[model samples]
Target: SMNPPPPETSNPNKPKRQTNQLQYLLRVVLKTLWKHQFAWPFQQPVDAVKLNLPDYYKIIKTPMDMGTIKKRLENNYYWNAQECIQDFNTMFTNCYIYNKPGDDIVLMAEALEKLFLQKINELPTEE
Candidate 1:
């Protein structure tokens, strides 16, 4: 995220510029996930009403509509849509406290791995 994203004069109308950017990127993620059939059990084609998570695993049998696909992600297990963003924020905050890391990018990635997905094998090494 560019801390200095966007010219100051950008319009703040119906949909803000950053939001429009975010939605565009999200569409990309959604497309790749769908194209690779990675969106899987979460999206249930045209018959998505019967579908609910935490669902059993399956591959995509057919293309899912945009509305249903969107719903599937909205009902995520570990976190909802807003909370997904919040989770990343919490993760980075804990990273700052635990790693007290600086300069090294790899260390930050390792720290992110330890905290973000919660694959932490041990407590904060320096906490």
Candidate 2:
């Protein structure tokens, strides 16, 4: 005999409400990140023309910035929290590739990356 489809409530329908909770958690992390002292460099997209780095785009295939990251999050563009974190990684990695190791911005990225990794690990894992 075939069994009836399990009731949605029976499994807590994992996807239904978790997204809201995760988004809220991610928003908190982003707000903290935005307020960080080293966040200024990543606050907005680099103006390649103004900065005279015409080749910037050629090197950084996927540019990311805090402002755009926030916008994407607000728009629910990410399927999960990891996608959000990955954008942060992309932003920092781009900075590393474009700037010298001793450059102030690169140092800032180092500090921010440390703090970001520390904070990110505190996120609750799914049961």
Q: What are the models' TM-scores?
A: 0.25, 0.78
lDDT (tens digit, per residue) of candidate 2 on 1-127: 1222211212222332336435754567788878998898788787777677778877877888787777766656666777678888988999999889999989999998898887777776555
- lDDT by residue (1-127, candidate 1, tens digit) is 1111211222234232223323422454444434433233223332323434112113222222333434333333222234233433433443344333564533643444444344212222211
Top model number, TM-score: 2
Once fitted onto the true fold, the runs of candidate 1 whose alpha carbons sit more than 4 angstroms away are 1-75, 78-80, 101-127
Candidate 2 matches the true fold with a TM-score of 0.78
Best by lDDT: 2
Candidate 2, clashing residue pairs?
Answer: none
